[PDB]
């Protein structure tokens, strides 16, 4: 527990209600939703409901209409309840509806989304294919134009809500010769004819999270569903990652908060040597440091998002926040875990699973190796600035 | 026994033994890792064709069945073991230095003839309840009590956490017998399972080292014969510390093997993956995290074969396992996550084993005392060795 | 705000003093630091500027700024000089601090208004031979006799000791109240009965002094005493808070000018065809540097803004000061490492930003002690 | 004090005889020959005598007969003693005296090594140059042969020893156009026509050794005066430094020990809040991982040693046994400052000067990140074959 640097009431309010949403709706579910591996389908249809799924998206879209400030809260209060539904949240706001948002069509936001504000249609984002993710420039799959459609051909790999999105942003090669200069985004309808879902990743954690190849064999959709101009999908997909950054930074915070709240409520009931653990000195510097850790996070993560909101660069930022925050969320899920001793390790605490959440934090949307080359450029360009 | 270049060039014993239980694990444990964690299975069978082989009972004397081998011996093969599977490794390392251990150190003639020899082949293994739900990390306070009952003892108690408490025919248990001596008045008995008066606790559902069994021993006024304490009364603090010395020592090297697997598999998938037009291991990044990881095994092996080595020089080893366990345990979570790093997406998923080997190594910061207490073992001993 | 729109001022403020640094600091700061120099015409410039009394009111000759300018300005002075750095924040924080949130009328007029300028300035006396993190065993003691406190006891490491012409004294009025039993003084320097000990031969901030202050039947006026008796030991804490805050922006600057260097030295150090800024690890090192300093500063500047809207800060102030203090020896210890031998020698300032770097995480309250604070307002936070 | 599972009588003897001689001898002028930044001169020959300058040396040759262990033995406690002297002795037996006993002829070691093993004349090691230190294989500095001798052009960098030794083993491009191949060694004596010391460095640490570049200047030397073959220089460099890593990874046990020794008398002694530092549990947790950071890069400093010894191959083991005892140097001399904490930071105490010291064991003889290039080739090489 932190102090509001200054927060404004919008967002005290919007941290309220998300919190309480997650400890009355994702709190009890969660141990199901990973031990289940089960889609939290009835949360997420509330959560679109409340605009959780679609909260940067104006109203007149459909969406909330709020800030990347508030989606940072209400991420990190969401993960906080539920890592699967925060990273389900965190896919259909920023990877998913951001890109559309920053480079659709009129047409194309009231279409692909507007029906993807409410919670009855999430979407993906189709980026990652077998043979690269961090190498992302290298996507092999590629869009073809023929007649009044692009024929897509290749696998996407590791799609997150793979299984229950309506709709994808995939980036294929529209030329591949033309290398990160060759990528395009499509909206892709989910399903349609020439998608084949690839079976479910048996995953270390966010379990509740469906994670699946996209198979485009032949798969052919409009020639309008292109996203933005061919060619321009590699800047779209790097720009929807830095947005995206902040949100998995805000999942790790989440999975960190809640992890040091599992800490702390274990430590000071559980006994050792006549008093609570948070007696010994040595957990009160583990307390010490996870709270450091998380709120050093948070304020890194807070300021990626209060950057993107008044429309100031924050790349290196964002990455510095999912960064910190995901190495974070599993050093507070590791120790975490060390408090809770032969309890951190069991299922009957929800610790191992946080450790487990953790993981992937420091993975997808650019592993902790990405997110330091992206800020090692950035922090070079700005003192050759 | 022992010199000093044995630390550096294994006896040629050793190296054999060091060959032998890489083939067995990579034959027989390899092939079945992911099953024995995904399905959390016991793994019964290889488990007997290591107790064929000697290796859940290896320290053990061969007039008494075992492979008579030493503790250098078994940490090369822990690591060999664990590095096929943690679960197995935990299993054979609970057999030997648990279970056996005490056995083996404290017993009588008569008691090691009945409790270690028909648990080194692999057809019944032993277990070792010290923990209790109350307290895991203080070995001088069981709330399970030992009352003198004529020819017999009776347990009271729920001793929390044991390690093949599913599958173990017996248990070195540690009670109170004199609850007012505190860490004087504890007691160790080698008690049967099944037996009348002893409940087994449901499985505890794991992070790893699914494969192997961990319950509660429930002991509701459970006789067991006299000549079943370990050693004389209020022994029993004792006897879990020092085994729980030897102990380390195989948890050590089990998590050796947690590390080395997950650094193979680091290296494996970074010669054969590719980014940015060349193998990952052409990243300066990979290189560094493989150089760490491996430095960071490399070392934790040398302390863990040191801890070893004084053990079967007779010497003390109580800062130098507690090193050892440490080391290893926090070098096989660093180690595995890296592993899993280095695989990224890959590491997330069971389609590769680095995920298992996190899960894995996260115990091993855990049990047989956490990496705190490992911290202030060391420290105390430290302190010991200037005063 | 953070990073996120300075406001007008600050910004101008930062602007102004790494103008300042830059132009007065960074050219006398190795000599500072060689020849244990302490900075007396920096200083005196300095409190022309308002930066030794940033947080003062105007009213009594302050800049009337408030802490988030207080930790832009000791970011930017440490950055050009550690020693200036702290030199500055005992003048702020330590020692105008307690005088301005607990000195009545007359004790300001005294003790702040002749402090603000430069032309003298303060010391805090809170640690003993004896007991530095344990604070509230100061056994100086001081005596109510006549119009007058006696005190007796050596105060041990006093920043600006041999430099400062008040001390804020923590003696204890009764060691049986334990840190109930500490009050807190305003003490003359020179006085009688006060001696100084001999100036600490120290690894950094070579061009503060440290020294004891050595009190032996050393009588001051009865309303010497800042607040009541009992209160110096919150007087500490509370200053310590504030101060804290100060040496977290002064770790920031020793930090952002190692990082200046090592940027700029593997920006020109060409290695296997490039500069060290190509290879791969230099980038990971500078990232997880910028990374350091960037949520270090974030913290700082929470702490800071907490203070200024008058919220609690304690917690905020200790993790900015262990984050910070952490973070410039890691960093500093880093651009030593990217400038390999470079980083050895005094051809090169990163082994001093490393040497006085690693005092930030010693001094108002070590890394461990701000750690337990950290501990126990995060628990109470949850209780 | 530490175990191991057995020393040789004559490494346990030789232990004592360092430890004796550096608690009466380095000891007292420790913090002078740091602060007056003095060559321990008078000691420096004292262990001449002794054999120390010489360990690995034949007897044959005027050295003490013994091996590397022994010598990272008398390293270690050396250094424990005073890091300056540690270094000019590390220099001396590894860097020095090592590539002529490795390379040279029996005549070389004659004229070379011999005069160098008691203490009356020291040598030097100078690999790297102002552009080039981390690269072994790309000296600017030139050996032109011209008949029967060899000519120097270019200034060799940061040369340990420098204002004090006899001698350097010089590298030297024979064959710039053959770079990693075209390096040669040579003995060069000093002083020498042609060779200029440049002024000393003024270092952080290890301050009683003089550190200086060489400008060599048409330095002529004797055709006889080349380390084995043209061509060689590299090899030769890279097993000199092999060796010099385990002198150096041993320089930083005695510098992490003496940092430990410091901080756990001190800790033992120093009362906070009722108790000695020792019952605080961070202290405790302090000390352990100091200890263990120590002890475990010991282990990996005395493979290393018996691996030579053995005629094994160490390059892998040399560059862990330094990297991990350098970093454990400057963690253990972090930690003990932390410790003492205001005497942590004063001449009051040694713990500041073994900070300074251990700095410099991350640097030189390779800098932990070509340790961790060296360990990061050498591991995928061992996997590759
Ligand atoms: C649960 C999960 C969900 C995912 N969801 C999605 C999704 O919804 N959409 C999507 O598009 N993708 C998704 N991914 C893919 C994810 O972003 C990738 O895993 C990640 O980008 C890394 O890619 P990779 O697996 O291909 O690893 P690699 O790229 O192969 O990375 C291997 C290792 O090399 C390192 N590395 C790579 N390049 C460099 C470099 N230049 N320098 C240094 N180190 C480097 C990496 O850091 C990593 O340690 C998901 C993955 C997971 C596990
Ligand atoms: C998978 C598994 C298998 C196990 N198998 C066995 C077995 O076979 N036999 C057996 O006897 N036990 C077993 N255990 C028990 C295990 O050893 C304990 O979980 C462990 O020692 C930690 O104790 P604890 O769980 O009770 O936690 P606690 O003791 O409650 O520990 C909680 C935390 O407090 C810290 N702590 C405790 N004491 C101190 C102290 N004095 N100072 C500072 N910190 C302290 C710990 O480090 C830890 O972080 C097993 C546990 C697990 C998880
Ligand atoms: C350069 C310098 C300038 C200074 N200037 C001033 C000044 O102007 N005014 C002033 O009042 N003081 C000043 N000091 C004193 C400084 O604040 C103290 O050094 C510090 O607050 C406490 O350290 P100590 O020296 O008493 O060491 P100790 O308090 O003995 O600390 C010893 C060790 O115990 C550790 N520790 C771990 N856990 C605990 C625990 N629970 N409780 C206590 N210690 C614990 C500490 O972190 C430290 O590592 C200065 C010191 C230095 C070095
Ligand atoms: C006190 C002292 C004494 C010395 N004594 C001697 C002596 O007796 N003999 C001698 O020959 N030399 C000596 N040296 C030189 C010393 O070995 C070098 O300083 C050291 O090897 C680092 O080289 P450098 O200074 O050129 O730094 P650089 O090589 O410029 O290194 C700068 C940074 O880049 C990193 N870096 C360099 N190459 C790579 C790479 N390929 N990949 C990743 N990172 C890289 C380095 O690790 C470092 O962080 C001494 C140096 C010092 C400071």
Same mark, same amino acid.
């Given at each position: 527990?932190?102090?509001?640097? @200054? $927060?404004?009431?919008?967002?005290?309010?919007?941290?309220?209600?998300?919190?309480?949403?997650?400890? +009355?709706?994702?709190?009890?579910?969660?141990?199901?939703?990973?031990?289940?591996?089960?889609?939290?389908?009835?949360?997420?249809?509330?959560?679109?409901?409340?605009? /959780?799924?679609? *909260?940067?998206?104006?109203?007149?879209?459909?969406?909330?209409?709020?800030?990347? $400030?508030?989606?940072?809260?209400? *991420?990190?209060?969401?993960?906080?309840?539920?890592?699967?539904?925060?990273?389900?949240?965190?896919?259909?706001?920023?990877?998913?509806?951001?890109?559309?948002?920053?480079?659709?069509?009129?047409?194309?936001?009231?279409?692909?989304?507007?029906?993807?504000? !409410?919670?009855?249609?999430?979407?993906?984002?189709?980026?990652?294919?077998?043979?690269?993710?961090?190498?992302?420039?290298?996507?092999?799959?590629?869009? %073809?134009?023929?007649?009044?459609?692009?024929? $897509?051909?290749?696998?996407?790999?590791?799609?997150?809500?793979?299984?229950?999105?309506?709709?994808?942003?995939?980036?294929?090669?529209?030329?591949?010769? /033309?290398?990160?200069?060759?990528?395009?985004?499509?909206?892709?309808? *989910?399903?349609?004819?020439?998608?084949?879902?690839?079976?479910? #990743?048996?995953?270390?954690?966010?379990?509740? !999270?469906?994670?699946?190849?996209?198979?485009?064999?032949?798969?052919?959709?409009?020639?309008?569903?292109?996203?933005?101009?061919?060619?321009?999908?590699?800047?779209?997909?790097?720009?929807?990652?830095?947005?995206?950054?902040?949100?998995?930074?805000?999942?790790?915070?989440?999975?960190?908060?809640?992890?040091?709240?599992?800490?702390?409520?274990?430590?000071?009931? %559980?006994?050792?040597?006549?008093?609570?653990?948070? +007696?010994?000195?040595?957990?009160?510097?583990? /307390?010490?440091?996870?709270?450091? &850790?998380?709120?050093?996070?948070?304020?890194?993560?807070?300021?990626?998002?209060?950057? +993107?909101?008044?429309?100031?660069?924050?790349? +290196? @930022?964002?990455?510095? &926040?999912?960064?910190?925050? !995901?190495?974070?969320?599993?050093?507070? !899920?590791?120790?975490?875990?060390?408090?809770?001793?032969?309890?951190?390790?069991?299922? #009957?605490?929800?610790?191992?699973?946080?450790?487990?959440?953790?993981?992937?934090? #420091?993975?997808?949307?650019?592993?902790?190796?990405?997110?330091?080359?992206?800020?090692?450029?950035?922090? $070079?360009?700005?003192?050759?600035?």
């Amino acid at each position: 527990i932190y102090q509001s640097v @200054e $927060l404004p009431e919008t967002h005290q309010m919007l941290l309220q209600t998300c919190r309480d949403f997650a400890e +009355k709706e994702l709190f009890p579910i969660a141990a199901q939703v990973d031990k289940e591996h089960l889609f939290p389908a009835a949360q997420v249809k509330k959560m679109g409901g409340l605009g /959780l799924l679609a *909260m940067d998206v104006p109203e007149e879209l459909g969406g909330a209409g709020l800030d990347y $400030l508030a989606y940072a809260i209400a *991420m990190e209060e969401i993960s906080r309840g539920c890592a699967s539904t925060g990273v389900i949240m965190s896919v259909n706001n920023s990877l998913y509806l951001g890109p559309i948002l920053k480079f659709g069509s009129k047409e194309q936001k009231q279409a692909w989304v507007t029906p993807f504000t !409410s919670g009855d249609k999430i979407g993906c984002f189709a980026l990652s294919e077998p043979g690269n993710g961090s190498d992302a420039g290298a996507a092999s799959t590629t869009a %073809r134009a023929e007649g009044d459609s692009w024929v $897509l051909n290749g696998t996407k790999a590791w799609i997150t809500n793979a299984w229950e999105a309506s709709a994808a942003v995939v980036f294929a090669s529209t030329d591949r010769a /033309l290398q990160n200069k060759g990528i395009s985004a499509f909206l892709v309808p *989910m399903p349609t004819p020439g998608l084949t879902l690839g079976k479910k #990743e048996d995953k270390l954690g966010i379990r509740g !999270s469906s994670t699946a190849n996209l198979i485009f064999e032949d798969c052919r959709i409009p020639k309008d569903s292109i996203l933005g101009e061919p060619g321009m999908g590699f800047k779209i997909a790097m720009q929807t990652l830095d947005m995206g950054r902040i949100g998995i930074a805000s999942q790790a915070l989440g999975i960190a908060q809640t992890a040091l709240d599992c800490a702390v409520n274990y430590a000071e009931n %559980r006994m050792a040597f006549g008093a609570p653990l948070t +007696k010994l000195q040595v957990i009160q510097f583990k /307390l010490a440091d996870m709270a450091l &850790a998380l709120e050093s996070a948070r304020l890194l993560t807070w300021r990626a998002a209060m950057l +993107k909101d008044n429309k100031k660069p924050f790349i +290196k @930022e964002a990455a510095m &926040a999912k960064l910190a925050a !995901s190495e974070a969320a599993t050093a507070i !899920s590791h120790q975490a875990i060390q408090i809770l001793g032969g309890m951190g390790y069991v299922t #009957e605490m929800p610790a191992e699973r946080h450790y487990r959440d953790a993981r992937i934090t #420091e993975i997808y949307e650019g592993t902790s190796e990405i997110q330091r080359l992206v800020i090692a450029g950035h922090l $070079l360009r700005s003192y050759r600035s």
